[PDB]
C-alpha cells in the first residue's frame, strides 16, 4: 500500500528502484519483534491469538 | 452586638435516596460545562 | 394548533405540519417534492418541530438490529400526542403567570397594606410621597396586565378540553 | 411516591448532567471521566449546531444514537 | 518518509465505538489558489466533483489557533498528543512562516456517508517551498 | 471489464450511476475503474451529468440526455404569489376588502385548466410552463393555507389569507396572529418554549 503511492502519482517517466521505501517499515520487524519479546505479549492479528 | 451562634452535636438517623431534578443538577452546580476545549494551548496548557 | 405553529414557529413550520398530515407516513424525499423550500431550511424547521410533539419519527430497520446507519425515516402526525403536550405546555404557562403574579403582590405587600390602610379614602395624595404611587401604578397595571394574558391563554387552552 | 417533588417520572431521563468534581476524577495525564466528559459535550455540540444549521433525519439520529451510547458508556461501559 | 509515517501512524486509531482515519502530506503538486486546493480536494476523494463549490467557505484562521483544539481533540480522543509532531511537520515545511486555510462549508461532502461523526481538515499553504499539507481527520463510527 | 459497467449503467437505465456504488457488485480494483472511466470518456459513450438527488457526487450515463428533477431556485417564490392573485380575482372584486358576497350561484373558483394557460399567457422565461404539475404547486397553497380546495378538482382562495393587507379589536382572535404586537422587555411574559 505504499509501492502503488507512486506508480498512480506523476512523474510517470520518471521511474523508482521500489528499494527506498524499504527502510521506512523495516522498522516495525526490529520494533515488533522486540516488543513481544520484551513485554511477552502476544498479538498476532492473521492467526488470532492474544 | 453579635447574634448567639449555637450548635448540636447531631448524629445520622437515615439514608434518603432519590434521583434529581433539572432543578437538582442546576442548584448544585457551579459551573455549565460547554466547550470540549480541556487546555487552552496558548496560556502554557492552564484549564480552559 | 396549525396557527400557534404558524405565530410561534414561523409559517413555514405550519407548511410541513399539514404536508405531514394528509400524507400521514411522510418521508423527506416525499417532502421537498410537496414543499418549495431549500433543503436545509426543511431540515431545520422540521427539527425546530420534531422538539414537540407536532411530528414522531418512524423508523425502518433495514438491518437486523434497529440501527440509524442505514435506514430511512418515516413522520406520523399523531392527533392526541400533539394536542396533550400543548394542551399542557400551555396550562404550565398558564399557571407560571399566576406564580409571577402572587410573588410579586407578595413582595409589595408593605406598598399594599399601605395601600389599604392609610388612604382607605384619602387617595388624592396617597397621605404619601408620589416616588412610589407611580410604582403603585407599575404595580397594578401588571397585575392587571397579568389577568389579560391570563383570559388571552384560557381561550386557547379550554380548546383541547373538549 | 410523588410528594417530593423530584419524584415525577421524568426525572429518571438524562434531560441534565452533572459533571463531577475533579476530586473524583483527578489528573496524574487526563482521566477516564474526563475524557468521557468532553466527548459527551462534543457530541451535543454537533447535536446542537446541528438543529440548526440542518442536517438529516439519518445523521441526526446517527449522531442521538451515539450521543446516548456514551453516557452509556460513562456509567456502566459494559 | 519515515518521520512521515510515524506522524501517519499518530492519526489512524479506533477507540471503543469510534474509527478515526485522517493523515498529513506534503507535496508540491488569493485568486489562483482557488483552484489549486479543489484538485487536491479531487484527488483526496475521487468520486466527488470539487469544481462545483468555488465560493466555498475557506476559513482563513490563525494556525495557532488550529493546531490548538486540533490538540485539544487529541486530548478528547485520549491520545495524549505527542508533541515532537509539530516539528516533524515544520521541519519539512517551515511551519512559522506559512499560511493556513480550512474547507469547512455549510454542508460537507461526507454528510452523506453512513456512519459520519466529524471532520478536521488542514491546509497549510507554503510560498517559499509551494508545499500543501493536507491534515485530515475523519472520525466515524463502528 | 468495460462491458459489465455498460450493464451496470443500464441496469440504472434513465438516471445515471455514481462511482462509488459500482463497487456495491464489482469490489474490483479501485484505480483500474479509476482510469477505466477516465478513458470511456474519451470513448464518446458515457458522460459526466451532475445530480438531480443530493449534489457534489460523480454521476456517468451514456448519452441518453435524459435527468429529472428545478433544484430550488429562488425565483419560485414569486410566480405562485400571482398564481395566488389570479385564483383570488375569480372570489369576488378585491376592492370590497376594505365586503360584497354572493350566494352560491356564483362561480367564486377556478379549475386549475385555466390557471396553467394564464400562466402561459402571462409567460414566465422558464422551460417547462408545464401542466400536472401546477396542480402540485397550488398544493402548497393549500398547505400554506392561502387557499382551499373545491369541487375536488379545483382550488379557491380562502377568505384568511386576504387579510395579509397590513375599529374595535375583538377579543383575542387567535386567528390574527400577524397585527399582534411586541413589548419592550417586563417580566410577565409568556413563551412557548419555556416549559422545555
Given at each position: ?50 | ?48 | ?162 | ?78 | ?84 509532531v509539530w516539528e516533524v511537520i515544520n521541519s519539512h515545511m517551515t511551519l512559522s512562516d506559512c499560511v ?43 | ?175 390574527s396572529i400577524f397585527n399582534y404586537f411586541k413589548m419592550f422587555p417586563a417580566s410577565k411574559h409568556d ?6
Open positions: 500500500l505504499s509501492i502503488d503511492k507512486v506508480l498512480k502519482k506523476p512523474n510517470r517517466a520518471m521511474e523508482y528502484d521500489a528499494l527506498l521505501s524499504i527502510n521506512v517499515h523495516s522498522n516495525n520487524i526490529t520494533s515488533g519483534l522486540n516488543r513481544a519479546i520484551s513485554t511477552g505479549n502476544w498479538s498476532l492479528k492473521r492467526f488470532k491469538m492474544e | 452586638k453579635e447574634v448567639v451562634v449555637s450548635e448540636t452535636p447531631k448524629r445520622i438517623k437515615g439514608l434518603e435516596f432519590s434521583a434529581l431534578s433539572a432543578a437538582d443538577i442546576v442548584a448544585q452546580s457551579e459551573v455549565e460545562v460547554s466547550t470540549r476545549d480541556l487546555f487552552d494551548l496558548e496560556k502554557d496548557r492552564a484549564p480552559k | 394548533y396549525e396557527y400557534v405553529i404558524a405565530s410561534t414557529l414561523g409559517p413555514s413550520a405550519m407548511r410541513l405540519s399539514r404536508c405531514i398530515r394528509d400524507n400521514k407516513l411522510v418521508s423527506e424525499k416525499i417532502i421537498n417534492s410537496t414543499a418549495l423550500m431549500k433543503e436545509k431550511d426543511i431540515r431545520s424547521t422540521l427539527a425546530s418541530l420534531i422538539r414537540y410533539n407536532s411530528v414522531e419519527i418512524q423508523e425502518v430497520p433495514r438491518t437486523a438490529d434497529r440501527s440509524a446507519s442505514r435506514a430511512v425515516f418515516l413522520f406520523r402526525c399523531k392527533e392526541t400526542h400533539s394536542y396533550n403536550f400543548m394542551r399542557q405546555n400551555l396550562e404550565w404557562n398558564m399557571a407560571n403567570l399566576l406564580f409571577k403574579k402572587e410573588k410579586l403582590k407578595q413582595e409589595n405587600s408593605t406598598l399594599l397594606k399601605k395601600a389599604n390602610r392609610d388612604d382607605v379614602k384619602g387617595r388624592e395624595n396617597e397621605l404619601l410621597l408620589p416616588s412610589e404611587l407611580n410604582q403603585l401604578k407599575m404595580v397594578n397595571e401588571r397585575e392587571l396586565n397579568v389577568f389579560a394574558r391570563l383570559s388571552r391563554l384560557l381561550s386557547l387552552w379550554e380548546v383541547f378540553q373538549m | 411516591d410523588a410528594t417530593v417533588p423530584s419524584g415525577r417520572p421524568e426525572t429518571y431521563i438524562w434531560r441534565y448532567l452533572p459533571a463531577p468534581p475533579v476530586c473524583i476524577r483527578p489528573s496524574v495525564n487526563e482521566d477516564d471521566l474526563t475524557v468521557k466528559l468532553t466527548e459527551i459535550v462534543w457530541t451535543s455540540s454537533l447535536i446542537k449546531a446541528g438543529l440548526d444549521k440542518g442536517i438529516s433525519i439519518n445523521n441526526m439520529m446517527e449522531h442521538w444514537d451515539y450521543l446516548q451510547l456514551t453516557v452509556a458508556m460513562y456509567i456502566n461501559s459494559d | 518518509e519515515l518521520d512521515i509515517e510515524r506522524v501517519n501512524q499518530t492519526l489512524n486509531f479506533e477507540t471503543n465505538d469510534c474509527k478515526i482515519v485522517g493523515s498529513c502530506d506534503i507535496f508540491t503538486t488569493s485568486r489562483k489558489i482557488f483552484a489549486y486546493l479543489i484538485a487536491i480536494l479531487n484527488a483526496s476523494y475521487p468520486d466527488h466533483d470539487f469544481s462545483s463549490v468555488e465560493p466555498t467557505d475557506f476559513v482563513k484562521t490563525s494556525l495557532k489557533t488550529f493546531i490548538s483544539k486540533f490538540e485539544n481533540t487529541l486530548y478528547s480522543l485520549g491520545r495524549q498528543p505527542e508533541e515532537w493556513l486555510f480550512q474547507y469547512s462549508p455549510s454542508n460537507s461532502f461526507l454528510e452523506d456517508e453512513p456512519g459520519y461523526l466529524w471532520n478536521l481538515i488542514g491546509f497549510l499553504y507554503n510560498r517559499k517551498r509551494k508545499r500543501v499539507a493536507y491534515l485530515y481527520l475523519i472520525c466515524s463510527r463502528l | 471489464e468495460e462491458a459489465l459497467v455498460y450493464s451496470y449503467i443500464e441496469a440504472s437505465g434513465r438516471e445515471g450511476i455514481w462511482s462509488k456504488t459500482i463497487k456495491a457488485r464489482t469490489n474490483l480494483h479501485q484505480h483500474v475503474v479509476l482510469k477505466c472511466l477516465k478513458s470511456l470518456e474519451s470513448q464518446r459513450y458515457v458522460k459526466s451529468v451532475k445530480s438531480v438527488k443530493f449534489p457534489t457526487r460523480k454521476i456517468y450515463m451514456l448519452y441518453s440526455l435524459q435527468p429529472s428533477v428545478e433544484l430550488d431556485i429562488e425565483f419560485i417564490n414569486s410566480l405562485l404569489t400571482i398564481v395566488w392573485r389570479f385564483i383570488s380575482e375569480n372570489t369576488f372584486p378585491n376592492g370590497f376588502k376594505n365586503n360584497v358576497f354572493y350566494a352560491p350561484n356564483v362561480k367564486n373558483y377556478s379549475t386549475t385548466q385555466e390557471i396553467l394557460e394564464f400562466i402561459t399567457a402571462a409567460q414566465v422565461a422558464n422551460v417547462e410552463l408545464t401542466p400536472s404539475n401546477i396542480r402540485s404547486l397550488c398544493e402548497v397553497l393549500v398547505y400554506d393555507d392561502k387557499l382551499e380546495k373545491v369541487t375536488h378538482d379545483c382550488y379557491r382562495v380562502t377568505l384568511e389569507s386576504i387579510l395579509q393587507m397590513n375599529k374595535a379589536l375583538e377579543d383575542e382572535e387567535e386567528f413563551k412557548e418554549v419555556v416549559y422545555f
